[PDB]
Amino acid sequence: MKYIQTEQQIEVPEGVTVSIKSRIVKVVGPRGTLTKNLKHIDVTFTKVNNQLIKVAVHNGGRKHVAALRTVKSLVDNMITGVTKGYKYKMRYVYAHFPINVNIVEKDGAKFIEVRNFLGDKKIRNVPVRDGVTIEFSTNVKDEIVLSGNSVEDVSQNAADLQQICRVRNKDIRKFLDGIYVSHKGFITED
Amino acid sequence: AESHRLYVKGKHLSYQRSKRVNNPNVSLIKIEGVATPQDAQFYLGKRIAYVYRASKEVRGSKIRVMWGKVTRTHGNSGVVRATFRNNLPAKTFGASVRIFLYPSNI
Amino acid sequence: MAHFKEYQVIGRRLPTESVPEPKLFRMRIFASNEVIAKSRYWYFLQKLHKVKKASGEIVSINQINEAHPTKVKNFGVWVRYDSRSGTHNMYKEIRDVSRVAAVETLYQDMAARHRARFRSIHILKVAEIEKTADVKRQYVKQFLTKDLKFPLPHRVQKSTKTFSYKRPSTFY
Amino acid sequence: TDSIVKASNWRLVEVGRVVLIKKGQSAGKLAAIVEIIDQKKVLIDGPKAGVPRQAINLGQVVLTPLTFALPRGARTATVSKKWAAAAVCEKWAASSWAKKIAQRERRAALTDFERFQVMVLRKQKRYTVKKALAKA
Amino acid sequence: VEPVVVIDGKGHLVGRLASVVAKQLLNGQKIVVVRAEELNISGEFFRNKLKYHDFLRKATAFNKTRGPFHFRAPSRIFYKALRGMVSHKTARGKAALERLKVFEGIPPPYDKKKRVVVPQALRVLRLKPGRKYTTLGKLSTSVGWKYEDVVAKLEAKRKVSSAEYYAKKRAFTKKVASANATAAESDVAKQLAALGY
RNA sequence: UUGCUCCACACAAUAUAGAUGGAUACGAAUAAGGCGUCCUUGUGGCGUCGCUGAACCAUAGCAGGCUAGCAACGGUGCACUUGGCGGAAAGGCCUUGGGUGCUUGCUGGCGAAUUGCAAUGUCAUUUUGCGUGGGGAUAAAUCAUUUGUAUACGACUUAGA
RNA sequence: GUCAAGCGUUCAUAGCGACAUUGCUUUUUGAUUCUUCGAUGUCGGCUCUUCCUAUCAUACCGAAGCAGAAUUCGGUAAGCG
Ligand SMILES: [Mg+2]
Ligand SMILES: [Mg+2]
Ligand SMILES: [Mg+2]
Ligand SMILES: [Mg+2]
Ligand SMILES: [Mg+2]
Ligand SMILES: [Mg+2]
Numbered sequence A: 001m002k003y004i005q006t007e008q009q010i011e012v013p014e015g016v017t018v019s020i021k022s023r024i025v026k027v028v029g030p031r032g033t034l035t036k037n038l039k040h041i042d043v044t045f046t047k048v049n050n051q052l053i054k055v056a057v058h059n060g061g062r063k064h065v066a067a068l069r070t071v072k073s074l075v076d077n078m079i080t081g082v083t084k085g086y087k088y089k090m091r092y093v094y095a096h097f098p099i100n101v102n103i104v105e106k107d108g109a110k111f112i113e114v115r116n117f118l119g120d121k122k123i124r125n126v127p128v129r130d131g132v133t134i135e136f137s138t139n140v141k142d143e144i145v146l147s148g149n150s151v152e153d154v155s156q157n158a159a160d161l162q163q164i165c166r167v168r169n170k171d172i173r174k175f176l177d178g179i180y181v182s183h184k185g186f187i188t189e190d
Numbered sequence B: 001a002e003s004h005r006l007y008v009k010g011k012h013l014s015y016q017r018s019k020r021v022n023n024p025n026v027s028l029i030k031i032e033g034v035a036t037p038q039d040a041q042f043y044l045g046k047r048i049a050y051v052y053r054a055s056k057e058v059r060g061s062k063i064r065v066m067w068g069k070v071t072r073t074h075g076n077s078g079v080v081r082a083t084f085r086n087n088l089p090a091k092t093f094g095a096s097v098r099i100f101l102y103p104s105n106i
Numbered sequence C: 001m002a003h004f005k006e007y008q009v010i011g012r013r014l015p016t017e018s019v020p021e022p023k024l025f026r027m028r029i030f031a032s033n034e035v036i037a038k039s040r041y042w043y044f045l046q047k048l049h050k051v052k053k054a055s056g057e058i059v060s061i062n063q064i065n066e067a068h069p070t071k072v073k074n075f076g077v078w079v080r081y082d083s084r085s086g087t088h089n090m091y092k093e094i095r096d097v098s099r100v101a102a103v104e105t106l107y108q109d110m111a112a113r114h115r116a117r118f119r120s121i122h123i124l125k126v127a128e129i130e131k132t133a134d135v136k137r138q139y140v141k142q143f144l145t146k147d148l149k150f151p152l153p154h155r156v157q158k159s160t161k162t163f164s165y166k167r168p169s170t171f172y
Numbered sequence D: 001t002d003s004i005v006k007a008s009n010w011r012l013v014e015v016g017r018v019v020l021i022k023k024g025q026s027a028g029k030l031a032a033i034v035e036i037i038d039q040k041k042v043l044i045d046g047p048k049a050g051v052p053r054q055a056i057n058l059g060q061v062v063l064t065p066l067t068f069a070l071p072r073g074a075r076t077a078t079v080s081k082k083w084a085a086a087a088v089c090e091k092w093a094a095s096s097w098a099k100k101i102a103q104r105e106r107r108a109a110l111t112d113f114e115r116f117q118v119m120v121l122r123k124q125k126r127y128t129v130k131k132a133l134a135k136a
Numbered sequence E: 001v002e003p004v005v006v007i008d009g010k011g012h013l014v015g016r017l018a019s020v021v022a023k024q025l026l027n028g029q030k031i032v033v034v035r036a037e038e039l040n041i042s043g044e045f046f047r048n049k050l051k052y053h054d055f056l057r058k059a060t061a062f063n064k065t066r067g068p069f070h071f072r073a074p075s076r077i078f079y080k081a082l083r084g085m086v087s088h089k090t091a092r093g094k095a096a097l098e099r100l101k102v103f104e105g106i107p108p109p110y111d112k113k114k115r116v117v118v119p120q121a122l123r124v125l126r127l128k129p130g131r132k133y134t135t136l137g138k139l140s141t142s143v144g145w146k147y148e149d150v151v152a153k154l155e156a157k158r159k160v161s162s163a164e165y166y167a168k169k170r171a172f173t174k175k176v177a178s179a180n181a182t183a184a185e186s187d188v189a190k191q192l193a194a195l196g197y
Numbered sequence F: 001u002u003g004c005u006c007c008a009c010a011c012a013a014u015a016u017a018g019a020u021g022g023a024u025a026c027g028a029a030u031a032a033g034g035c036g037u038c039c040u041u042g043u044g045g046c047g048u049c050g051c052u053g054a055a056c057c058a059u060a061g062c063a064g065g066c067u068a069g070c071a072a073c074g075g076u077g078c079a080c081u082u083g084g085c086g087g088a089a090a091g092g093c094c095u096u097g098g099g100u101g102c103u104u105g106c107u108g109g110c111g112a113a114u115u116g117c118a119a120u121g122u123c124a125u126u127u128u129g130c131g132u133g134g135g136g137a138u139a140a141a142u143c144a145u146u147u148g149u150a151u152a153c154g155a156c157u158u159a160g161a
Numbered sequence G: 001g002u003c004a005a006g007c008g009u010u011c012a013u014a015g016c017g018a019c020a021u022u023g024c025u026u027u028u029u030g031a032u033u034c035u036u037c038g039a040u041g042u043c044g045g046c047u048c049u050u051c052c053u054a055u056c057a058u059a060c061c062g063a064a065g066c067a068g069a070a071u072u073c074g075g076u077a078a079g080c081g
């Protein structure tokens, strides 16, 4: 169809600075800073009144309009992640063998070590990505809390811990074992 | 001055040809700076010299010339067709010829 | 088909001694030249009446121009065509300044989108949509908003020289 | 704490946009866009420069940085009134773009004796310039 | 028009460039192509990688040293593309190929010479925005070419010195252009403006 | 039986995938940049440019002679020199200083003809050779003999004043 | 391969699948006598190399009427047996 103009809104709240040269977006707030290279898209950003940035596609087909609301959602994720921050909570699910996860250092690389998953002698190792801060819940039994600015970094680190603890050669309908994400939320949320 | 050019530089490109049969009696010339058949009508009838060197001296010269003239245009892009008194030797495909401004009109 | 022309063709079905003055059928024909328009006349009346060219007569062919060729008109084109596996009716909307230059677009659009040739297509009706909000299609309702303006990003400038010296730009 | 989003400027296909025909019987004449037919094709009108009111692709057309107030669908008499009242032809001729069009018309029109004069004058200007480079 | 023409291969589409260069070589023009590691081919990287593996898998069965020679460097992929556009088995097409030099990066002499582009072959002019393309450097290091990191080290060195050149060249063209504007309003320079100069 | 190489200029032969003013150097982006400028030195403000190199530089003089001055202290060529940078294939780029011409920036004086109405009308750059007068240098390999870490033969690997 | 009446304790499609229907192979077997009668040495074996994938095993997976063990259906895959 090639719609003439599709357009989206981005609400920049009171503490946030958004800076967009060519298609590289820099979002600065109370929690740090974030950068995305959006040069694969071809949208056009325009600043209206310092609390609002439009993003537009001119003469765009169905897939090109489709990526426009993606670009809105990604910058809003950056804005949320530098104002409220991002926080994931994972619980350990085990039947018989308890799962031992402690935050570990190997050559200054800050891994996550998982011993005794299903009684495996194999120690599993997940590296902590930068920005993600691993926490172990007090007054919740067997909960790991991943916190940081990027929802891309926090959720992929929470994805990597689930993916390393998969169950092999068993019926996974019964062998329900692993570390699963229980909550996707913010840090400064109430 | 440093320049004494009183001709226009050209290139001997090809014989007149189909896909699989060439005609050596007609040669196709790319005049430099001409990009249109309407531009190339200026050069029709102008004399072309292919100036080349040898080792045997014949008449007080080691430089020999092949003389011919533009006859018509070729294609859409300023290539012209030229005919020579003896046909160009086909090792000169890509060689430079000289398109003189005579017989002049404007 | 460099540009289509609208013709009126009037045909008669030749007078007999029983019937002098037969009934004068008129069509509006989009065609390239008058040869095709008379051929398109007899092809269409042979779908409607017991008449053919060997028993009929062309009494007038006149070329109809557009009354206001420099006014932008929303048209509604009714078209019937044959696909590879059946016959379909179809309604499309073309915004254009001529009827014969909307029929250019329609024959271009049905070939591009439905692989329908000239021989497959019958133009049922071209009418100009007189009032806005009787415009049905959204691809032409785009261009009917108040104070419409759009950029043209990524300008590619043609060159006549095989070499450039600048690493060009696409601003516009 | 100022948000800095880059401008991303663009000349718009709009009513009142002054254009320059680059292909056709005009080929270098100004015209104004009157109504937008679709995405590649507009209705233009060039009444001061003698361009017929016509439906044209934007591929024979360059947008120019000039825009004047013009109602949508305005006729050829109305366009010429708003053209002169907005004084497009002197707004266009002051631009660097029109000067380079006019200069290359002038350079192509020079006779051989005038080309000699350009050589003579340029060596005079070069003598003044190259002296001025060494002094400062 | 120049005795040799030096093409920057960055941002060019490979077959649109190779058809331009092949016609120029057979017309008697000498061409050197630099930066062949930053050529472009249309289509996704995986798309174009399967194309090499299909080419990589054909070779003479009874003697693999007689078959197609699967040349891996980006300048040789571009040389392969330009072959097959030239009658390379005839003396005319051999002479055309002698008029061609192709390099990765910008080596000497050519690091201090002017680089042209071919806008018939330019990616940003010819491909639709939103399409996917591959860079020939990343394709070549996946099919077995060993010197991407060396050329990237040498080009980064090359761009450091070349920026120092242009930083001096900007300063000189300040001094020149401010003198020419001050030598304007002269009765010569009003008389040169009359003649269109 | 004065052999070899380098430097320069003197002449022969050799040819030419094709001189005929100049290959005239940022990088990156292209839904963005370039240049100028300002400050708080930024993913900054302001101005301005593109819409092709149709540019820019060069470019006048018996293929460019001989000669007179004016202005300016500029431009350019050749040879010496000074210092720096360049290893991707550097083999070039930028400098200091003197000598040496030329200068059409400006104004003069003399020459040109008969190549006869046009004939590339010969002006380039390779290889070599011979000659001159200036510098430099003062070996190896192979056969034949030998070894057996090698070997059909060659080849290999060793040894011998 | 499609469709799904039914089988599969209920439940068409975990695994199956009638009556129909649409294709693939040239390694099975059938049709031309196209080439060979101034002769292309006729089967099997041994030896030895390479190729295909329509995958038996091995690597990694998805599904189950997969609790485990063992199976079965399916994917990538001819690298290696
Ligand atoms: Mg698994
Ligand atoms: Mg099991
Ligand atoms: Mg040819
Ligand atoms: Mg021909
Ligand atoms: Mg360059
Ligand atoms: Mg290898």
Ligand SMILES: [Mg+2]
Pocket (backbone or CB within 6 Å): none
């Ligand atoms: Mg001079």
Ligand SMILES: [Mg+2]
Pocket (backbone or CB within 6 Å): G038
């Ligand atoms: Mg026989």
Ligand SMILES: [Mg+2]
Pocket (backbone or CB within 6 Å): none
């Ligand atoms: Mg398979």
Ligand SMILES: [Mg+2]
Pocket (backbone or CB within 6 Å): G055
């Ligand atoms: Mg398997």
Ligand SMILES: [Mg+2]
Pocket (backbone or CB within 6 Å): G055
């Ligand atoms: Mg399997």
Ligand SMILES: [Mg+2]
Pocket (backbone or CB within 6 Å): none
């Ligand atoms: Mg294989």
Ligand SMILES: [Mg+2]
Pocket (backbone or CB within 6 Å): none
């Ligand atoms: Mg194998």
